[PDB]
């Protein structure tokens, strides 16, 4: 679990969104595994606006932050889970990093701010849903 709190927005994995998220919905995209809801309180996270490919992510199943090298956002085949069917998830970045279902939500960050959230993984893989192109998160 986990979210990004930027301005009056809460960014979460779409597959982990709550009823309150859906009842206060700003934007969602199943192909990206992302959902954004509105908040009453202002958040403290800042979004990175860059092309970094190195950063640090939080892994809840290890209680640790790990430095990683990650690929550029791409259209990457993701195996069927109880959450989605075979398909191609867009805007996804991969790194070598131990993950588990319950790690989705953990933040990936670089020197500029928050880059994305954990979304997928596998036998020493972890994939992150990028948020750096969502420029509107910085306003309103
Ligand atoms: C960190 S997720 C993970 C890690 C190790 C192994 C398996 C997973 C689960 C996983 O990959 N998915 C279930 C959640 C939704 C994802 C979007 F298509 C796909
Ligand atoms: Zn950066």
Distance CA 135, CA 126 (A): 24
Declared resolution, Å: 1.1
Distance CA 5, CA 12 (A): 9
Lookup result for tokens 């190195």: 54
Distance CA 23, CA 36 (A): 11
Q: Where are the domains of the chain?
A: 3-44, 45-140
Q: Mention every residue, 6+ apart, whose C-beta is less than 8 A from residue 115.
A: 48, 52, 55, 93, 107, 108, 109, 128, 130, 131, 132
Distance CA 53, CA 30 (A): 24
Distance CA 36, CA 62 (A): 27
Residue 103 beta carbon below 6 angstroms from any ligand 1 atom: yes
Q: Which residues carry out catalysis?
A: 15, 33, 104
Residue 101 beta carbon below 6 angstroms from any ligand 1 atom: yes
* Selection from 59, 63, 47 nearest residue 95 by Cα: 59
Distance CA 70, CA 87 (A): 21
Question: In angstroms, what is the C-alpha Rg of the chain?
Answer: 14
Experimentally, the structure was elucidated by: X-ray
Tokens (6 digits) for 4: 């990004």
């Amino acid at each position: 679990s986990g979210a990004i709190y930027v301005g009056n927005y809460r960014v979460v994995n779409r597959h982990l969104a709550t009823h309150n998220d859906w009842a206060n919905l700003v934007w969602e995209d199943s192909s990206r595994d992302l959902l954004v809801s509105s908040t009453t309180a202002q958040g403290c996270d800042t979004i990175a606006r860059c092309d970094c490919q190195t950063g640090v992510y939080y892994c809840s199943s290890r209680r640790k932050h790990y430095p990683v090298s990650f690929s550029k956002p791409s259209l990457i085949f993701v195996e069927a889970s109880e959450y989605y069917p075979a398909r191609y998830q867009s805007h996804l970045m991969l790194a070598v990093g131990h993950s588990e279902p319950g790690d989705c939500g953990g933040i990936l960050r670089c020197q500029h701010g928050v880059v994305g959230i954990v979304s997928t993984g596998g036998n020493g893989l972890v994939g992150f849903a990028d948020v750096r192109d969502l420029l509107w998160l910085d306003e309103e």
